[PDB]
């Protein structure tokens, strides 16, 4: 209970629109502590579609309860006719827009370290018996280039076909195994530098082509071993899909020799930050706990 | 790897925050190369040291400031040896403790005052273990990270550079003989506590500094703060003793102020004190998540 703070409307203000999605509008905001004169920047998500507040609050307590360096915690809530969710502000934005804007300068060690971190987050959520149901590059937030976090779980509970497991499309079944499917699509988005999955295919026909065996194609930089994993994520038989613990191991092993599983021109020019740059980044933007990025042997 | 060398072209000063004996502090924005983000920083541009010091020696002294690790001391994060000396530290939106206590002159509870005395002495004890003499401890040189977490800044600047001599904070032997030690810092600590317990009064108000040495040798000191039990005031008096080695040591100051904080209303007499408690568990959880990712009654 002590992890969710109930904000009052006068305590905070919206100052800029950061974008919008299926479930609401995200704003940059400013949190005015009562009696103080400081302006603390936040991210506010205002839901869409104004006794349901008990429901909403009880899921908000679960969202506020997640303590993992690769999943964003819900910090606070304001309950007016539109529910408002307050979270930490990530000025780098989402990983989808990050990889699109850096399509010509992202090195192999970044890409592989991101999928390790996304797996760690999803593994934590699976250990909590929590199903995300909307994993995608757009829903991974860049806190620093070296540290990314999953966002927006639980929002679906209270339609992204091209990221959905087949059984989710046909039968609205969501498990940790269908999250693994969306993880595969997420990895594919990153390895393609933000391509749209199944570009040119109507979403209404995705379940037809999936049943016939068709899958997203092999990104030009992915070796065979990396494409295998992604394909193992899209198995029809969910119980045959890898588990999140397995993906951590697999992507950490590849991150220890990144230039053997990703082939990208200029890959030499693009290693992880110096110890110096990492200390500087962390002191200004990221002082929370974290397991170190896996470096090449 | 703790001190980042910054290029003039990757950070720009914005609004002047204030000026003191060592230089001018700006609010600035760090812009990492290749990125689109603006990261707020504080920049202290230094006055010309009338000690004409070599660049590399400045680097060596900056490394020591960059190598302090303690929750109640501010780290030097970056430096630029431009055409001037520019120091990059984390921006504290709450500003110095002195202005904080003045603006909240009568909503500062005993729990906050005593806890602040504890934290300041911890950071000074840390400096003493590292054999670092501050020389300019004052409430203006304690920064408020959150109201519940403060930090000592500007240590070693008086060392580095050589009006601007805070005579009213100096121990007798520093005014008389230029003797700066850790026991000399304990005197300035005592004065700092006085500033706190008076809600930011100017010490020896109305007395010129040329007279300070004279009135100390006559035996008169700062007067008992209206809120201070003799228990607290006896501590302050001990800091201002003539023999430097009879003054308290910081770790004893840590112990005694921590003992008093466990029964704060027995050591400070504040009207409406029970209404000014330390934040609820939720409120600090939220404060820390947003601002501070790094003793109760
Ligand atoms: N905490 C945050 N800080 C900064 N930007 C954020 C934050 N949360 C979300 N955003 C951005 O706000 C925009 C809208 O996010 P959102 O409303 O979740 O839509 P979406 O995630 O892109 N699509 P979806 O999540 O499937 O509904 C996106 O560009 C996100 O990158
Ligand atoms: N990192 C920081 N973040 C925010 N405010 C700061 C920071 N550093 C300093 N300030 C504020 O800026 C003011 C001006 O800086 P400064 O030159 O140190 O003045 P001063 O501390 O009052 N005098 P001095 O005893 O020489 O240090 C300080 O009084 C602080 O309130
Ligand atoms: Mg989202
Ligand atoms: Mg100062």
XYZ file of C-alpha atoms and ligand atoms in Angstrom:
658
model
C 0.000 0.000 0.000
C 2.884 2.337 0.916
C 4.312 2.111 -2.601
C 1.413 3.863 -4.354
C 1.025 7.582 -3.665
C -2.399 9.156 -4.213
C -1.801 12.583 -5.779
C -4.243 15.457 -5.686
C -5.061 17.397 -8.837
C -3.541 20.662 -7.582
C -0.196 18.923 -6.873
C 0.775 18.467 -10.520
C 0.366 19.980 -13.981
C 0.723 18.803 -17.589
C 3.134 20.851 -19.672
C 3.806 18.899 -22.914
C 2.259 16.010 -24.837
C 4.784 13.184 -25.286
C 2.571 11.008 -27.511
C -0.493 8.815 -27.265
C -1.504 5.198 -27.707
C -4.369 2.717 -27.514
C -4.955 3.181 -23.784
C -4.309 6.885 -23.250
C -2.212 10.022 -23.654
C 1.225 10.481 -22.089
C 2.245 13.962 -20.929
C 5.363 15.506 -19.551
C 4.375 17.027 -16.212
C 5.618 18.930 -13.196
C 5.018 17.727 -9.621
C 4.697 20.599 -7.089
C 5.339 19.206 -3.588
C 2.881 20.802 -1.204
C 4.371 23.809 0.543
C 7.498 23.634 -1.593
C 8.469 25.910 -4.502
C 10.327 23.313 -6.612
C 9.150 21.900 -9.948
C 9.906 18.171 -10.320
C 9.441 16.801 -13.877
C 7.333 13.639 -14.213
C 5.563 11.560 -16.862
C 1.772 11.432 -16.580
C -0.419 8.949 -18.487
C -4.083 9.975 -18.589
C -6.334 7.050 -19.293
C -9.206 7.060 -21.805
C -12.930 6.363 -20.882
C -13.629 8.281 -17.600
C -17.431 2.141 -8.800
C -14.602 0.978 -11.109
C -12.155 3.001 -9.013
C -11.816 0.104 -6.516
C -10.842 -2.159 -9.465
C -8.435 0.435 -10.833
C -6.828 1.078 -7.428
C -6.296 -2.619 -6.700
C -4.438 -3.128 -9.975
C -2.554 0.121 -9.330
C -1.261 -1.326 -6.068
C 0.115 -4.334 -7.983
C 1.702 -2.018 -10.589
C 3.316 0.058 -7.801
C 4.680 -3.137 -6.220
C 7.215 -4.141 -8.908
C 10.856 -3.764 -7.820
C 13.163 -4.660 -10.642
C 15.786 -2.483 -12.366
C 14.323 -3.399 -15.794
C 10.635 -2.718 -15.111
C 9.129 0.721 -14.473
C 7.173 0.974 -11.260
C 3.941 2.953 -11.090
C 4.811 5.769 -8.648
C 1.432 7.416 -8.039
C -2.117 7.925 -9.239
C -4.746 10.686 -9.371
C -8.389 9.632 -9.558
C -10.555 12.176 -11.297
C -13.093 11.285 -13.984
C -9.978 10.405 -15.993
C -7.484 8.236 -14.138
C -3.993 9.737 -14.135
C -0.865 7.598 -13.666
C 2.408 9.218 -12.551
C 5.768 7.641 -13.351
C 9.376 8.685 -13.584
C 10.165 10.777 -16.681
C 12.510 9.138 -19.220
C 13.762 11.944 -21.509
C 15.377 9.528 -24.000
C 11.912 8.139 -24.813
C 11.079 4.664 -26.019
C 13.508 2.150 -27.481
C 11.586 1.950 -30.769
C 12.171 5.627 -31.489
C 15.704 5.338 -30.122
C 16.784 2.582 -32.551
C 15.090 4.353 -35.481
C 16.953 7.591 -34.736
C 20.305 5.764 -34.261
C 19.844 3.231 -37.124
C 23.363 4.051 -38.421
C 25.325 4.049 -35.146
C 23.993 1.286 -32.843
C 26.688 -1.343 -32.206
C 26.203 -5.048 -31.553
C 26.881 -4.896 -27.819
C 23.976 -2.480 -27.274
C 21.372 -4.551 -29.171
C 22.337 -7.771 -27.365
C 22.473 -6.082 -23.964
C 18.980 -4.656 -24.519
C 17.415 -8.085 -25.158
C 19.123 -9.394 -22.007
C 17.632 -6.562 -19.988
C 14.185 -6.966 -21.539
C 14.320 -10.695 -20.662
C 15.350 -9.934 -17.054
C 12.348 -7.645 -16.726
C 9.951 -10.226 -18.214
C 11.472 -12.980 -16.068
C 10.854 -10.875 -12.970
C 7.246 -10.330 -14.065
C 6.874 -14.084 -14.648
C 8.250 -14.832 -11.188
C 5.525 -12.457 -9.924
C 2.945 -14.458 -11.959
C 2.135 -11.213 -13.807
C 1.318 -11.260 -17.547
C 2.293 -8.167 -19.497
C 0.140 -8.604 -22.677
C 1.513 -5.533 -24.551
C 5.253 -6.046 -24.816
C 6.775 -4.243 -27.823
C 9.687 -1.928 -28.546
C 7.408 1.099 -28.053
C 6.846 -0.197 -24.475
C 10.517 -0.432 -23.540
C 11.838 2.857 -22.194
C 15.423 4.106 -22.457
C 16.552 5.451 -19.062
C 20.120 5.697 -20.348
C 21.318 4.110 -23.593
C 22.889 1.370 -21.392
C 19.769 0.749 -19.249
C 16.280 0.071 -20.590
C 13.101 -0.773 -18.740
C 9.769 -2.343 -19.652
C 6.720 -0.154 -19.186
C 2.927 -0.374 -19.282
C 2.150 -3.800 -17.849
C -1.266 -4.148 -16.256
C -2.540 -1.366 -18.464
C -4.086 -3.891 -20.923
C -5.908 -5.725 -18.085
C -7.748 -2.466 -17.207
C -5.515 -4.430 -30.171
C -1.822 -5.000 -31.004
C -2.389 -7.989 -33.304
C 1.026 -7.922 -34.970
C 2.689 -8.585 -31.559
C 0.238 -11.217 -30.344
C 0.673 -14.947 -30.054
C -1.717 -16.886 -32.263
C -3.682 -18.294 -29.318
C -4.152 -14.721 -28.050
C -5.661 -13.638 -31.363
C -7.989 -16.628 -31.727
C -8.935 -17.207 -28.064
C -7.857 -14.150 -25.992
C -5.470 -16.397 -24.073
C -2.567 -14.573 -22.433
C 0.161 -16.448 -20.571
C 3.839 -15.953 -19.869
C 4.293 -18.101 -22.967
C 2.416 -15.630 -25.178
C 4.515 -12.832 -23.658
C 7.501 -14.756 -25.044
C 5.928 -14.446 -28.528
C 5.724 -10.638 -28.145
C 9.294 -10.725 -26.846
C 10.311 -12.339 -30.136
C 8.557 -9.605 -32.108
C 10.214 -7.011 -29.853
C 13.656 -8.470 -30.545
C 12.810 -8.459 -34.250
C 11.839 -4.749 -34.065
C 15.213 -3.892 -32.485
C 17.352 -6.001 -34.867
C 15.607 -4.354 -37.852
C 16.183 -0.886 -36.300
C 12.481 -0.294 -35.836
C 10.786 -1.892 -38.873
C 7.076 -2.427 -38.685
C 6.232 -6.142 -38.390
C 4.316 -7.657 -41.346
C 4.343 -4.332 -43.180
C 1.714 -4.466 -45.901
C -0.440 -7.238 -44.376
C -3.815 -6.258 -42.875
C -3.962 -7.067 -39.174
C -7.282 -8.835 -39.839
C -5.374 -11.487 -41.832
C -2.350 -11.978 -39.534
C -3.805 -15.110 -37.895
C -4.347 -16.642 -41.328
C -0.701 -16.271 -42.369
C 0.621 -17.368 -38.963
C -1.326 -20.635 -39.091
C 0.138 -21.258 -42.551
C 3.667 -21.124 -41.053
C 4.724 -17.639 -42.153
C 6.804 -15.548 -39.758
C 8.678 -12.247 -39.699
C 11.832 -12.566 -41.839
C 15.465 -12.797 -40.751
C 16.837 -9.289 -40.079
C 19.866 -8.487 -42.278
C 22.214 -8.253 -39.278
C 21.093 -11.409 -37.405
C 23.129 -14.562 -37.781
C 21.403 -17.933 -37.830
C 21.673 -18.501 -34.053
C 19.826 -15.253 -33.231
C 17.096 -15.835 -35.801
C 16.531 -19.368 -34.388
C 15.637 -17.977 -30.932
C 13.208 -15.457 -32.427
C 11.575 -18.273 -34.395
C 11.482 -20.501 -31.324
C 9.503 -17.629 -29.742
C 6.798 -17.904 -32.419
C 6.148 -21.656 -32.144
C 2.488 -22.570 -32.489
C 2.846 -24.822 -29.433
C 3.364 -22.274 -26.643
C 4.863 -24.902 -24.324
C 7.612 -25.372 -26.954
C 8.586 -21.697 -26.797
C 11.727 -20.772 -24.821
C 11.329 -19.539 -21.290
C 12.472 -16.096 -20.196
C 15.210 -17.602 -17.996
C 16.575 -19.419 -21.073
C 16.617 -16.178 -23.107
C 18.635 -14.351 -20.444
C 21.288 -17.085 -20.671
C 21.302 -17.201 -24.503
C 21.517 -13.431 -25.032
C 24.073 -13.003 -22.231
C 26.242 -15.663 -23.940
C 26.020 -13.817 -27.226
C 26.691 -10.447 -25.618
C 30.050 -11.841 -24.449
C 31.095 -12.135 -28.126
C 28.691 -9.737 -29.830
C 30.452 -9.588 -33.225
C 29.870 -13.316 -33.829
C 26.078 -13.207 -33.743
C 25.428 -9.719 -35.162
C 27.157 -8.573 -38.355
C 26.927 -4.794 -38.855
C 29.225 -2.473 -40.757
C 31.228 -0.143 -38.530
C 30.604 -2.365 -35.499
C 34.088 -1.460 -34.218
C 33.121 2.266 -33.875
C 30.265 1.634 -31.411
C 31.329 -0.103 -28.184
C 29.621 0.449 -24.787
C 30.563 3.610 -22.854
C 33.858 3.994 -21.027
C 33.848 3.415 -17.285
C 34.110 7.221 -17.305
C 31.018 7.769 -19.444
C 29.052 5.186 -17.439
C 29.822 6.814 -14.082
C 28.843 10.191 -15.573
C 25.581 8.870 -17.026
C 24.699 7.156 -13.757
C 25.466 10.157 -11.535
C 23.240 12.428 -13.626
C 20.427 10.100 -14.671
C 20.500 6.627 -13.164
C 21.528 5.975 -9.544
C 19.329 2.914 -8.987
C 20.718 -0.599 -8.540
C 21.421 -2.693 -11.640
C 23.290 -5.799 -12.785
C 26.197 -4.760 -15.007
C 25.935 -4.900 -18.796
C 27.628 -8.016 -20.173
C 30.916 -7.109 -21.890
C 32.898 -8.948 -24.553
C 35.460 -11.495 -23.360
C 37.304 7.168 -14.445
C 35.268 9.152 -11.920
C 35.992 12.588 -13.467
C 34.625 13.217 -16.944
C 36.472 15.837 -19.002
C 33.740 17.869 -20.695
C 34.075 19.799 -23.960
C 32.860 23.404 -24.118
C 30.574 22.357 -26.978
C 28.691 19.627 -25.056
C 27.227 21.726 -22.197
C 25.800 25.254 -22.078
C 25.104 27.547 -19.115
C 21.566 28.912 -18.819
C 20.513 30.830 -15.683
C 22.816 32.165 -12.962
C 21.898 30.528 -9.618
C 24.078 32.635 -7.343
C 27.594 33.727 -6.509
C 29.935 33.401 -3.570
C 33.566 33.566 -2.493
C 34.786 30.934 -4.998
C 32.884 31.669 -8.229
C 29.448 31.657 -9.845
C 26.982 28.750 -9.974
C 24.877 28.339 -13.139
C 22.027 26.042 -13.989
C 23.186 24.376 -17.213
C 22.185 21.655 -19.674
C 24.395 18.710 -20.613
C 23.852 17.547 -24.201
C 25.550 14.214 -24.966
C 27.081 14.038 -28.473
C 24.825 12.157 -30.893
C 21.794 12.452 -28.619
C 18.779 14.769 -28.640
C 18.340 15.149 -24.864
C 19.117 18.066 -22.519
C 20.215 16.966 -19.100
C 20.057 19.667 -16.368
C 23.345 20.169 -14.512
C 24.738 22.684 -12.064
C 27.899 24.482 -13.246
C 30.264 26.320 -10.868
C 32.597 28.579 -12.818
C 35.502 29.491 -10.572
C 37.091 32.807 -9.841
C 40.697 33.212 -10.898
C 42.855 31.589 -8.232
C 45.400 34.236 -7.299
C 47.559 31.182 -6.827
C 48.620 30.779 -10.508
C 48.216 26.989 -10.592
C 49.152 24.581 -13.371
C 46.328 22.916 -15.304
C 47.436 19.359 -14.492
C 47.611 20.176 -10.768
C 44.011 21.422 -10.952
C 43.157 18.080 -12.552
C 44.860 16.236 -9.680
C 42.949 18.210 -7.065
C 39.698 17.731 -9.010
C 40.197 13.942 -9.018
C 40.117 13.937 -5.211
C 36.823 15.850 -5.256
C 35.578 13.328 -7.852
C 36.586 10.337 -5.703
C 34.452 11.040 -2.592
C 31.704 8.420 -2.076
C 29.285 9.073 0.777
C 25.527 9.844 0.744
C 26.101 13.214 2.524
C 28.935 14.610 0.358
C 28.489 15.967 -3.191
C 30.745 14.410 -5.785
C 32.523 16.422 -8.452
C 31.116 14.862 -11.665
C 32.904 16.645 -14.526
C 35.278 19.488 -15.251
C 36.192 21.696 -18.195
C 39.442 23.656 -18.256
C 38.079 25.912 -21.022
C 39.500 29.416 -20.709
C 38.114 29.351 -17.106
C 37.605 26.424 -14.669
C 34.078 24.987 -14.920
C 32.879 22.322 -12.465
C 29.952 20.045 -13.284
C 27.831 18.676 -10.454
C 24.291 17.387 -10.062
C 21.652 20.128 -9.973
C 19.879 20.362 -6.609
C 16.468 21.956 -7.315
C 15.890 22.549 -3.605
C 19.030 24.759 -3.226
C 21.091 25.202 -0.040
C 19.858 24.277 3.436
C 20.262 27.884 4.669
C 17.658 29.238 2.260
C 15.522 26.168 2.954
C 15.388 26.829 6.690
C 14.648 30.526 6.117
C 11.743 29.832 3.751
C 10.159 27.229 6.084
C 10.977 29.239 9.238
C 8.027 27.772 11.166
C 7.227 24.419 9.600
C 10.553 22.756 10.396
C 10.088 20.071 13.016
C 12.563 18.831 15.585
C 12.903 15.568 13.620
C 14.207 17.442 10.575
C 16.603 19.745 12.453
C 18.196 16.933 14.459
C 18.380 14.580 11.461
C 20.117 17.319 9.428
C 22.746 17.801 12.171
C 23.368 14.049 12.021
C 23.767 13.969 8.239
C 26.092 16.962 8.124
C 28.374 15.393 10.742
C 28.373 12.078 8.834
C 29.596 13.785 5.677
C 32.181 15.733 7.678
C 33.274 12.524 9.397
C 33.703 10.994 5.942
C 35.788 13.970 4.827
C 37.879 13.549 7.992
C 38.555 9.897 7.218
C 39.768 10.930 3.788
C 42.018 13.560 5.427
C 40.167 16.411 3.650
C 39.673 19.734 5.427
C 36.576 21.610 4.227
C 37.534 25.195 5.331
C 34.100 26.662 4.417
C 31.451 24.561 6.143
C 28.310 26.699 6.516
C 24.599 26.213 6.040
C 24.974 27.799 2.596
C 27.330 24.886 1.709
C 24.851 22.169 2.674
C 22.640 21.257 -0.321
C 19.100 19.910 -0.002
C 18.655 16.830 -2.180
C 15.267 16.115 -0.657
C 14.106 17.836 2.544
C 15.034 14.520 4.210
C 18.491 14.207 2.630
C 21.204 16.894 2.602
C 24.805 16.933 1.393
C 27.994 18.945 1.964
C 29.295 20.799 -1.056
C 32.221 23.070 -1.964
C 34.794 21.211 0.114
C 38.401 21.884 -0.848
C 37.653 25.002 -2.923
C 39.292 27.259 -0.318
C 42.210 24.820 -0.527
C 42.314 25.068 -4.311
C 42.030 28.844 -4.852
C 43.342 30.653 -1.791
C 34.018 39.489 1.661
C 35.358 36.077 0.797
C 36.800 34.981 4.137
C 33.820 33.675 6.149
C 35.347 35.110 9.340
C 32.150 34.491 11.328
C 32.370 30.714 10.716
C 36.097 30.308 11.353
C 37.645 29.001 14.548
C 39.865 31.383 16.509
C 43.091 29.741 15.309
C 42.086 30.110 11.624
C 41.426 33.852 11.939
C 44.594 34.394 13.989
C 47.064 31.943 12.441
C 45.653 30.526 9.136
C 45.434 27.104 10.828
C 42.895 24.883 9.015
C 42.274 21.391 10.430
C 39.443 18.948 11.075
C 39.115 20.419 14.554
C 38.794 23.820 12.879
C 35.946 22.364 10.792
C 34.194 21.350 14.019
C 33.864 25.032 14.972
C 32.204 25.866 11.640
C 29.983 22.824 12.250
C 28.890 24.385 15.540
C 28.102 27.641 13.786
C 26.251 25.699 11.063
C 24.053 24.023 13.677
C 23.326 27.482 15.158
C 22.181 28.739 11.742
C 19.851 25.737 11.554
C 18.431 26.158 15.072
C 17.743 29.882 14.492
C 16.062 29.171 11.135
C 18.795 30.918 9.219
C 19.837 33.891 11.371
C 23.008 35.740 10.481
C 25.613 35.019 13.194
C 26.940 37.915 15.292
C 24.501 40.160 13.319
C 25.605 43.786 13.568
C 29.180 43.017 14.677
C 31.893 43.688 12.075
C 34.239 40.809 11.355
C 37.355 42.777 12.410
C 35.950 42.542 15.937
C 35.218 38.789 15.844
C 38.631 37.680 17.077
C 38.318 40.205 19.907
C 34.938 39.023 21.173
C 35.887 35.326 20.972
C 38.992 35.869 23.105
C 36.777 37.702 25.600
C 34.740 34.493 25.932
C 31.397 35.488 24.429
C 29.796 33.191 21.889
C 26.607 32.984 19.884
C 23.491 32.938 22.078
C 21.269 30.024 22.907
C 18.658 29.511 20.120
C 15.145 29.998 21.543
C 14.209 26.409 20.534
C 17.376 24.761 21.983
C 17.472 22.922 25.280
C 20.761 23.430 27.111
C 21.566 19.846 26.046
C 21.768 20.991 22.423
C 23.380 24.327 23.291
C 26.127 22.612 25.357
C 27.119 20.807 22.143
C 27.414 24.049 20.175
C 29.458 25.636 22.988
C 31.831 22.669 22.966
C 32.525 23.294 19.249
C 33.677 26.851 20.026
C 36.308 26.036 22.656
C 39.726 27.664 22.413
C 41.852 24.513 22.408
C 41.119 22.829 19.077
C 41.723 19.357 20.497
C 39.134 19.763 23.289
C 36.319 20.291 20.772
C 34.110 17.303 19.900
C 34.940 14.943 17.077
C 32.479 14.390 14.268
C 31.769 10.743 15.166
C 30.790 11.838 18.667
C 28.657 14.562 17.115
C 27.080 11.777 14.995
C 26.384 9.713 18.110
C 24.884 12.466 20.275
C 22.651 14.047 17.627
C 21.480 10.520 16.690
C 20.607 9.850 20.329
C 18.686 13.120 20.566
C 16.821 12.392 17.327
C 15.315 9.303 18.987
C 13.495 11.649 21.403
C 13.420 14.904 19.438
C 10.818 16.776 21.463
C 12.891 16.370 24.611
C 15.781 18.302 23.043
C 14.018 20.975 20.973
C 11.013 23.063 22.012
C 8.876 23.761 18.922
C 5.278 24.979 18.936
C 3.101 22.623 16.916
C 5.857 20.018 16.690
C 3.727 16.849 16.550
C 2.117 18.219 13.392
C 5.534 18.403 11.637
C 6.582 14.751 11.462
C 8.939 13.083 8.999
C 7.210 11.963 5.791
C 4.881 8.981 5.780
C 6.298 5.744 4.310
C 4.447 6.431 1.060
C 5.642 10.038 0.802
C 9.343 9.159 1.098
C 8.918 6.123 -1.212
C 7.623 8.612 -3.809
C 10.216 11.302 -3.030
C 13.010 8.736 -3.430
C 11.707 7.170 -6.652
C 11.532 10.604 -8.337
C 14.427 12.543 -6.828
C 16.734 10.412 -4.683
C 17.434 6.952 -6.123
C 20.698 6.771 -4.169
C 16.677 8.466 12.927
C 12.995 8.572 13.897
C 11.475 9.246 17.300
N 7.548 7.422 -18.508
C 7.630 7.933 -19.735
N 8.529 8.922 -19.966
C 8.630 9.426 -21.198
N 7.949 9.086 -22.298
C 7.071 8.109 -22.040
C 6.848 7.492 -20.823
N 5.859 6.524 -20.930
C 5.516 6.574 -22.196
N 6.202 7.512 -22.924
C 6.039 7.834 -24.350
O 4.751 8.384 -24.552
C 4.242 7.992 -25.849
C 2.867 7.397 -25.688
O 2.988 6.157 -24.953
P 1.749 5.178 -24.880
O 0.526 5.941 -24.479
O 2.021 4.025 -23.914
O 1.616 4.596 -26.409
P 2.492 3.413 -26.956
O 3.276 2.741 -25.789
O 3.531 3.926 -27.898
N 1.450 2.343 -27.707
P 0.788 1.339 -26.524
O 1.683 1.338 -25.324
O 0.688 -0.127 -27.098
O -0.661 1.826 -26.119
C 5.282 7.062 -26.479
O 6.049 7.722 -27.481
C 6.148 6.630 -25.289
O 7.492 6.487 -25.728
N 24.854 21.929 -7.345
C 24.034 22.921 -7.000
N 22.713 22.792 -7.268
C 21.887 23.791 -6.925
N 22.177 24.951 -6.318
C 23.481 25.046 -6.068
C 24.470 24.108 -6.360
N 25.715 24.546 -5.954
C 25.470 25.726 -5.422
N 24.152 26.088 -5.466
C 23.555 27.332 -4.958
O 24.154 28.444 -5.609
C 24.541 29.436 -4.639
C 25.763 30.169 -5.141
O 26.921 29.283 -5.063
P 28.236 29.583 -4.196
O 29.214 30.266 -5.093
O 28.845 28.334 -3.552
O 27.700 30.559 -3.023
P 27.780 30.331 -1.474
O 27.712 28.881 -1.121
O 26.522 30.954 -0.785
N 29.163 31.095 -0.898
P 30.516 30.123 -0.619
O 30.705 30.027 0.953
O 31.803 30.762 -1.267
O 30.362 28.747 -1.189
C 24.757 28.660 -3.344
O 24.532 29.477 -2.198
C 23.723 27.531 -3.441
O 22.486 27.899 -2.837
Mg 3.115 2.434 -23.722
Mg 28.890 27.244 -1.844
